[PDB]
Design a protein around this ligand. Structure first.
Ligand SMILES: *[C@@H]1O[C@H](CO[C@H]2O[C@@H](C)[C@@H](O)[C@@H](O)[C@@H]2O)[C@@H](O[C@@H]2O[C@H](CO)[C@@H](O[C@@H]3O[C@H](CO[C@H]4O[C@H](CO)[C@@H](O)[C@H](O)[C@@H]4O[C@@H]4O[C@H](CO)[C@@H](O)[C@H](O)[C@H]4NC(C)=O)[C@@H](O)[C@H](O[C@H]4O[C@H](CO)[C@@H](O)[C@H](O)[C@@H]4O[C@@H]4O[C@H](CO)[C@@H](O)[C@H](O)[C@H]4NC(C)=O)[C@@H]3O)[C@H](O)[C@H]2NC(C)=O)[C@H](O)[C@H]1NC(C)=O
Ligand SMILES: *[C@@H]1O[C@H](CO[C@H]2O[C@@H](C)[C@@H](O)[C@@H](O)[C@@H]2O)[C@@H](O[C@@H]2O[C@H](CO)[C@@H](O[C@@H]3O[C@H](CO[C@H]4O[C@H](CO)[C@@H](O)[C@H](O)[C@@H]4O[C@@H]4O[C@H](CO)[C@@H](O)[C@H](O)[C@H]4NC(C)=O)[C@@H](O)[C@H](O[C@H]4O[C@H](CO)[C@@H](O)[C@H](O)[C@@H]4O[C@H]4O[C@H](CO)[C@@H](O)[C@H](O)[C@H]4NC(C)=O)[C@@H]3O)[C@H](O)[C@H]2NC(C)=O)[C@H](O)[C@H]1NC(C)=O
Lengths: 34, 208, 208, 34
């Protein structure tokens, strides 16, 4: 597994600057290029 | 009439963004002459229609089995979202409803501890390599073993057990040949959990 | 609807110690509030026996009834594979309900008992874990306890038996202790009770 | 518990010389006297 994918996903999942819509959008982005 | 059982995603799927977690709804006891089954899905009340329903399968016992699968968002499960499956069948007074979510409670980081065989076991052709994982919450977890960058599949892990402090613990046992151990080979027990940084950790074990 | 019945096997530790009293328990639930007359019949390997002890039904909180009957058994009879059948007759039943139970069939196997001390990484804690791995036994009926200085240690949690890859079972018992008790040289023992053990018992000590 | 009893019970239990009724009796006695 892409350890890059896991790190970004984890960070986005815990980023306090993102609200649910923002997090979901960021995670979808990470997912799509993963 | 027919019965329903709702299943949660595999721990590993909700943790890896590469994997695809799902909630599964299974309908049993569907009648031949009242076989029409319909599923309705809701995430925290909001109905969704992306579920995928599988072709019923006449059970060896002369009844039925229908399955629908709702793909879910890792974060949503991880964040406590509730999934409800509603099954409607003419043989029911009213539709059946089942709901599930991740156990409630503050996640607790699991501590991993590798332990070498017992001296007494060295008298054998095969020895046990132990990985104790304790103090984690919720109980959802995944444990594996590898060596020389390759997976080791000769292990069995116990189910999680409720400790006295509200956390869970478990043990994984990798059985290897004494020679492979005494030969200084290195083994690692990796753990995947929500409360682990990057949902991952490892702990090695070898001779000395 | 109608009342349901569940038959329970004796506790491992009970069938193994002559000091104890093993017993098979027949529990009947959802017993109608109107027709609560319940009658048990017990047979051992087909032949009826009349020494069971039936308890007075208990009104559940869910407005149903619960009736329990207890049959004491001979340690040898159970260990020797005798079959126990509880037969329950209640008005609300077309026909009586029958349930049978006995020891698991199969070649007994002696458990290997191995004690493992706390992992280095755990000594950083105020409490450490003493592990006892019990492998290769059959059937899976077994009882594990801890002690120290001729006295029982009770802060332990044992995992259920798990099926090993060779057909046998294994489990782990974890005793939690204050690091000072450990590091102070105290001697702890893991005692196991299984039918395939000489005298149904064995122990293995653990200390620094 | 008494380890003496456990030893006699276990012994009776596996004594090949005793038959079902004989074993039962001996164990009952081991049971009744401890
Ligand atoms: C006609 O035949 C059908 C086919 O049966 C086949 O199974 C075998 C074993 C044998 O029976 C053969 O006949 C067939 O080969 C019968 O279908 C079965 O119907 C029974 C109910 O009568 C169902 O029982 C439930 O089983 C689940 C466990 O199911 C999982 O695990 C099974 C093996 O472990 C596996 O076969 C199933 O596929 C299923 O697997 C899971 O699948 C999902 C996705 O599909 C995966 O994600 C999982 O990884 C996978 N897991 C595994 C493991 O593989 C069990 O959990 C249920 O227990 C609950 O409900 C009981 C009452 O039904 C109750 O007594 C229990 O105590 C328990 O109750 C729950 O307790 C929790 C607390 O922990 C509470 O929180 C809950 O509220 C409470 N739940 C409820 C509802 O109250 C249950 O035992 C069985 O699953 C089903 N088999 C298949 C296949 O669908 C059919 O019954 C039969 N009809 C007749 C008239 O004869
Ligand atoms: C009205 O209220 C009644 C009382 O409710 C009580 O329960 C609470 C949760 C509250 O609701 C509260 O009201 C009250 O405390 C209800 O009674 C309950 O009825 C259900 C069935 O409908 C019974 O379920 C069975 O449970 C068995 C296990 O029971 C033990 O463990 C539980 C806790 O885990 C404990 O509460 C029980 O008392 C019992 O405890 C044991 O008791 C022994 C005797 O004293 C003792 O020696 C033990 O040490 C002790 N053990 C423990 C751990 O404490 C299960 O075995 C049954 O499961 C089998 O059957 C289900 C289907 O029924 C299958 O899905 C399942 O697979 C399983 O086995 C099947 O498969 C195996 C293979 O693995 C095979 O061998 C079996 O043959 C096969 N079985 C079948 C039948 O096919 C049941 O789940 C429950 O015991 C009972 N509770 C009590 C306290 O009596 C009423 O249901 C309720 N009525 C209504 C309409 O709501």
């Amino acid at each position: 597994f892409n350890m890059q994918c896991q790190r970004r996903f984890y960070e986005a999942l815990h980023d306090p600057n993102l609200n649910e819509e923002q997090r979901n959008a960021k995670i979808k982005s990470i997912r799509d290029d993963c | 009439g027919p019965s329903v059982f709702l299943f949660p995603p595999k721990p590993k799927d909700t943790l890896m963004i590469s994997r695809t977690p799902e909630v599964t709804c299974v309908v049993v006891d569907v009648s031949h002459e009242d076989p029409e089954v319909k599923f309705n899905w809701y995430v925290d009340g909001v109905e969704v229609h992306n579920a995928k329903t599988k072709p019923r399968e006449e059970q060896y016992n002369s009844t039925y089995r229908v399955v629908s699968v709702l793909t879910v968002l890792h974060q949503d499960w991880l964040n406590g979202k509730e999934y409800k499956c509603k099954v409607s069948n003419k043989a029911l007074p009213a539709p059946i409803e089942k709901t599930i979510s991740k156990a409630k409670g503050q996640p607790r980081e699991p501590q991993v501890y590798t332990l070498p065989p017992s001296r007494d076991e060295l008298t054998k052709n095969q020895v046990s390599l132990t990985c104790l994982v304790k103090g984690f919450y919720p109980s959802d977890i995944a444990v594996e073993w590898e060596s020389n960058g390759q997976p080791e599949n000769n292990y069995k892990t116990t189910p999680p057990v409720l400790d006295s402090d509200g956390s869970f613990f478990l043990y994984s046992k990798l059985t290897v040949d004494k020679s492979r151990w005494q030969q200084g080979n290195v083994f690692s027990c990796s753990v995947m959990h929500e409360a682990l940084h990057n949902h991952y950790t490892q702990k090695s074990l070898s001779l000395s």
